[PDB]
C-alpha cells in the first residue's frame, strides 16, 4: 500500500505561491518533513514563515514557538540523525535566538554522540556550539578522553583531539611534554583494542612533524646556471613571494623558470647567469639567494677555478628521515617498540601492529633496523596482501632514504640503489647534487617528471626495470649516459622526451621491444641527432 | 571488522543496466531529480546509450528550473541550489545544449555564494560545505568562468579543511570522509592545487578503505558501498595512487552489487538497486579500465569524451 503524501506537498506550494507566511503551512511541513527530512526546499519555506514572527508577532508566540522547534528538531533527528537539512535548521535557529541556550546544547550533543559515537553531523554541530559558547579547548579535550575510554571504535574522537591539542600547545608533532603523554594515551588505546584503526592512524600522525624553506642552492659555471630547490612545490614570482639574487653583494635581476619552462609549482627553479658573475675579475664570486615570503636565505661561493659550488641542507643535519629523539623521547619509543613485538605474539595477524613496528624503527634508527624493517615488510605483505602495492612503495621510499643518508654520510654524489626491488622513487628533490645514479635491477615502471630536480646527474643507470615511461628524463642539463637496457619501452615515441637532454651522448636501449621496429636505428638518429651513440 | 560476504554475479550486465535506467522513471525522489537525471543520463552515456533518453523533455525541464537568480532547483517549483545547478550544467554539458539556461546568471548565482573565507554556502540559507566548494568550481570550470570567483581564497578555505590523516571533512575541523575527499581533491585538481595534497598519506588512508570483501567504505569501521568505490577510486586517480587498490577484489565486489534481474547496481550485494549506485558502479569499473564503458573523468564524473570536447580536464597527479 501507499499514502498520497505528495498532496500535502502540492498544498504547501499553493499555500506559498501567494504569500501565506502563516502557521497553516508551518504544520503541514512537519508532515512531509517527518518522512523526507532531506526535502531541503521545505526546510526553507518553514525557515521563511517562522522568521515572519521573530520580529513581528508577540514574543509570547515567537519565543514560545521558538522552543516549539527545538522540540520538533529532536523529533526529526531521532528518526533521522544523519541529515544535513535538520542539523542545519537547528544551527540556523540557535544562531538567530537572542538568548545563548548553549548550555542545553552541549548536552543534546553528548546525547546523540552517545547514541552514535560515529556521527560526524553531531561532532560538527558540537564544534559549532563549542565555538559559539566559546568552550575552552581543554574542556572539550576531556570530553574526548572519556568518549575514548568507553568506546571501542572512536575515530571522530581522536580526530577531534588532533585539532584540540595543537591549539593548546604550539621539533615533534606536539611539545615533547604533551607528546610523550598523548602517546601513552594511545599506546593502550590499541593494546586494549588493536582492531580499532583509530588508535593506529592517530598513532602514525604522532611520529611526524611539519616543515618550516630554501633547501639548496647550486651554481654550475659551465652551464652559467643557478639552481634552487624548495622544501615543497611553490611558485616563484607570485603571491607566495619570489626569489632575489645577490651576486657579489649586489642585486642582479634574473628571470626564474622551472626545468620545463611551464613554471608551475615545483621544487626546482633556475636562472641564467651573466658573464660578470662567473668571470675572473675576482678570486671568487658570492651568490646569495633570498626567498621572500619565508625569507629563507642561502649563499654559496664560487672560487676562481672551481666548476661549481653549492649550499645544501643535509637531510641528516635537517632530520627529514628521522627526528633525533631526545634522551627521554628515545626511551619512550624504544619502550614503545618492544611492547609492540609482544602485541604481535598475542595478535600475530594484526597488520596494524606489524606496520607500526616498522614506523617505530624508522623513528629510532632507520639504518640500524634495516635488516629488521625488511623482514617485517615480508611479514606484513603476507598478512595484508591487498596493500602490496602500498607496502612496496613505502619500502621503496624508506630504502631510498637510508641510501640518501649513507651518501650524505659518505659525502659523495653517487647514489647506489641497484638490487633493492624498488617500485617507485621518492624525495627526488634531495638528489639535486647527485652526479651518478644507479637504479638498475628494480621494479620501477617509470622514471617520473620529478626527476627534473637532478641538475647534476651525469650518468643514469636504469637497466633491468619495468620502465614503460621515461618522460621524467626530459630537461636534464648534464645527463650524458642513459642506460635503459632490458625494460618495457614499447614504441619509439617513448624516447621522444630525450631530445631535451642537450648533453646526452650515450643511449643504451638494447632489450626493449622498440628495437624490433624496422629502421629504428635510423628513426632514432633523426629524433636524437645530438646523441652520438645509440645502441639498439 | 564488519565487512560483507559475496555469494556465488561475476559478469558486467551492460544491457540489463541500460534497460533499468532507460525504464526507471517509467515517488519521494523528486527533491533531487535534477541530480537524478544527471546520474541516469551520465551512466547511460558511459554505456554509449545516451540516445535512449528524452533530451528535449530534459532540456525543457532544466530551463523550467532556473529561477530568476541564476540558481537551478532539483525540480520545478522547488528551491535553487548549487548542487542541482552543477547537475544541470553537467546534463547540458554532455548534451552540448549548454545554451538552454542563462549562463550569465548561473555564474552570478555562484559567486553570490562565496564568503570572505573562500568557502561556499549551499544556497542563500548559508550552509558552508567543501561539498559546495566543489560544485562551484566544477560549474564554473564547465563554463570557462572559473574566474568569476575568488579562486585564491576558495583554495585557502579548502586547504584549511585538511586533517591529520591527509583527508578532508565538511568544514574546518571536520572529520576526514571519502565523499569529502573527492570534492576537495576534485576542486584541488580543477584549481591546480594538487601539489598541496599529500599523496602518500591520503593515498594510504584511502586504500585502507578497502575491506576483505574487495569493496570500499567511506571511512574507518564501516561497510563497503559500491558508491564509495567511485568516491575512493576517483580520489585515488586524481592524487595518483590508484595502483594502491586491488583492482580485482574491487572488480568482483562492484560486479556482485548488480541485480542479474532488474539490472542496475545496488549499494551492497543483495540490497535494492537504484540509479545513484548504477552510475558509481559503472563509473567505478570505468576508472579500473573496462572495455565497455567510456573513460570517465575522475573529476567531473562525466565521459572523458564530453570533457575533451569542452576542453576542460585538469591534469591529475603525476
Amino acid at each position: 500500500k501507499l499514502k498520497l503524501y505528495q498532496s500535502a506537498t502540492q498544498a504547501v506550494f499553493q499555500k506559498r505561491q501567494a504569500g501565506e507566511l502563516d502557521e497553516s503551512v508551518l504544520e503541514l511541513t512537519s508532515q512531509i518533513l517527518g518522512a523526507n527530512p532531506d526535502f531541503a526546499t521545505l526546510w526553507n519555506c518553514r525557515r521563511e514563515v517562522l522568521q515572519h514572527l521573530e520580529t513581528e508577532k508577540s514574543p509570547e508566540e515567537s519565543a514560545a514557538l521558538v522552543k516549539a522547534e527545538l522540540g520538533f528538531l529532536e523529533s526529526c533527528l531521532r528518526v533521522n540523525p544523519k541529515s544535513y537539512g535538520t542539523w542545519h535548521h537547528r544551527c540556523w535557529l540557535l544562531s538567530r535566538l537572542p538568548e545563548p541556550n548553549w548550555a542545553r546544547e552541549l548536552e543534546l550533543c553528548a546525547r546523540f554522540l552517545e547514541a552514535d559515537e560515529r556521527n560526524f553531523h553531531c561532532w560538527d554541530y558540537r564544534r559549532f556550539v563549542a565555538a559559539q559558547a566559546a568552550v575552552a579547548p581543554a574542556e572539550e579535550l576531556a570530553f574526548t578522553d572519556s568518549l575514548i575510554t568507553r568506546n571501542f571504535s572512536n575515530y571522530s574522537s581522536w580526530h577531534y583531539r588532533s585539532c584540540l591539542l595543537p591549539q593548546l600547545h604550539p621539533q615533534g608533532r606536539l611539545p615533547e611534554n604533551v607528546l610523550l603523554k598523548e602517546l601513552e594515551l594511545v599506546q593502550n588505546a590499541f593494546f586494549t583494542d588493536p582492531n580499532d584503526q583509530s588508535a593506529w592512524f592517530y598513532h602514525r600522525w604522532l611520529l611526524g612533524r611539519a616543515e618550516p624553506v630554501l633547501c639548496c642552492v647550486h651554481v654550475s659555471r659551465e652551464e652559467a646556471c643557478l639552481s634552487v630547490c624548495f622544501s615543497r612545490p611553490l611558485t616563484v614570482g607570485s603571491r607566495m613571494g619570489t626569489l632575489l639574487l645577490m651576486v657579489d653583494e649586489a642585486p642582479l635581476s634574473v628571470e626564474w623558470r622551472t626545468p620545463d619552462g611551464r613554471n608551475r609549482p615545483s621544487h626546482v627553479w633556475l636562472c641564467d647567469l651573466p658573464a660578470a658573475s662567473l668571470n675572473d675579475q675576482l678570486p671568487q664570486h658570492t651568490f646569495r639567494v633570498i626567498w621572500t615570503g619565508s625569507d629563507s636565505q642561502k649563499e654559496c661561493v664560487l672560487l676562481k677555478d672551481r666548476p661549481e659550488c653549492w649550499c645544501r641542507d643535509s637531510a641528516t643535519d635537517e632530520q627529514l628521515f628521522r627526528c633525533e629523539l631526545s634522551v627521554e623521547k628515545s626511551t619512550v619509543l624504544q619502550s614503545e617498540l618492544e611492547s609492540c613485538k609482544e602485541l604481535q605474539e598475542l595478535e600475530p595477524e594484526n597488520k596494524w601492529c606489524l606496520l607500526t613496528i616498522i614506523l617505530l624503527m624508522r623513528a629510532l634508527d632507520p639504518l640500524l633496523y634495516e635488516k629488521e624493517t625488511l623482514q617485517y615488510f615480508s611479514t606484513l605483505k603476507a598478512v595484508d596482501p591487498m596493500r602490496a602495492a602500498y607496502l612496496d612503495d613505502l619500502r621503496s621510499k624508506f630504502l631510498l632514504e637510508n641510501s640518501v643518508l649513507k651518501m650524505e654520510y659518505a659525502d659523495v654524489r653517487v647514489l647506489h640503489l641497484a638490487h633493492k626491488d624498488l617500485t617507485v622513487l621518492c624525495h627526488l628533490e634531495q638528489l639535486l647534487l647527485v652526479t651518478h645514479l644507479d637504479l638498475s635491477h628494480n621494479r620501477l615502471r617509470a622514471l617520473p617528471p620529478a626527476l627534473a630536480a637532478l641538475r647534476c646527474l651525469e650518468v643514469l643507470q636504469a637497466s633491468d626495470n619495468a620502465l614503460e615511461n621515461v618522460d621524467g628524463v626530459a630537461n636534464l642539463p648534464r645527463l650524458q649516459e642513459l642506460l635503459l637496457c632490458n625494460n618495457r619501452l614499447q614504441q619509439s615515441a617513448a624516447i621522444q622526451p630525450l631530445v631535451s637532454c642537450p648533453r646526452l651522448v650515450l643511449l643504451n636501449l638494447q632489450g626493449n621491444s622498440l628495437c624490433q621496429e624496422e629502421g629504428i636505428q635510423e628513426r632514432l638518429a633523426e629524433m636524437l641527432p645530438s646523441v652520438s651513440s645509440i645502441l639498439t | 571488522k564488519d565487512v560483507t560476504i559475496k555469494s556465488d554475479p561475476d559478469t558486467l550486465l551492460l544491457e540489463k543496466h541500460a534497460d533499468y535506467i532507460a525504464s526507471y522513471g517509467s515517488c519521494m525522489s523528486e527533491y533531487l531529480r535534477m541530480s537524478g537525471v544527471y546520474w541516469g543520463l551520465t551512466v547511460m552515456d558511459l554505456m554509449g546509450q545516451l540516445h535512449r533518453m528524452n533530451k528535449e523533455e530534459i532540456l525543457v525541464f532544466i530551463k523550467s528550473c532556473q529561477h530568476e537568480c541564476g540558481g537551478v532547483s532539483a525540480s520545478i517549483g522547488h528551491d535553487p541550489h548549487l548542487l542541482y545547478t552543477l547537475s544541470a550544467v553537467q546534463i547540458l554539458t554532455l548534451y552540448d545544449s549548454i545554451h538552454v539556461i542563462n549562463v550569465d546568471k548561473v555564474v552570478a548565482y555562484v559567486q553570490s555564494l562565496q564568503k570572505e573565507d573562500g568557502s561556499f554556502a549551499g544556497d542563500i540559507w548559508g550552509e558552508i560545505d567543501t561539498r559546495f566548494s566543489f560544485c562551484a568550481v566544477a560549474t564554473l570550470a564547465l563554463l570557462g568562468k572559473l574566474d568569476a570567483i575568488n579562486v585564491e581564497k576558495a583554495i585557502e578555505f579548502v586547504l584549511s579543511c585538511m586533517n591529520f590523516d591527509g583527508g578532508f571533512g565538511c568544514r574546518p575541523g571536520s572529520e576526514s570522509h571519502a565523499g569529502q575527499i573527492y570534492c576537495c581533491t576534485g576542486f584541488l585538481a580543477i584549481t591546480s592545487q594538487l601539489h598541496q595534497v599529500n599523496s602518500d598519506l591520503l593515498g594510504w588512508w584511502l586504500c585502507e578503505r578497502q575491506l576483505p570483501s574487495g569493496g570500499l567504505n567511506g571511512r574507518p569501521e564501516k561497510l563497503p558501498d559500491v558508491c564509495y568505490s567511485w568516491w575512493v577510486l576517483a580520489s585515488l586517480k586524481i592524487i595518483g595512487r590508484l595502483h594502491w587498490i586491488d583492482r580485482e577484489k574491487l572488480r568482483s565486489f562492484i560486479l556482485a552489487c548488480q541485480d542479474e534481474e532488474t539490472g542496475g547496481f545496488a549499494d551492497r550485494p543483495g540490497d535494492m538497486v537504484d540509479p545513484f549506485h548504477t552510475l558509481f558502479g559503472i563509473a567505478g569499473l570505468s576508472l579500473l579500465g573496462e572495455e565497455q564503458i567510456k573513460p570517465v573523468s575522475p573529476v567531473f564524473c562525466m565521459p572523458e569524451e564530453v570533457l575533451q570536447r569542452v576542453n576542460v580536464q585538469p591534469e591529475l597527479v603525476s
Binding site: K82 | S29, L32, G179, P275, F276
Partner: peptide, 4 residues
C-alpha cells in the same frame, strides 16, 4: 538514493 543518497545520504552522506
Amino acid at each position: 538514493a543518497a545520504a552522506a
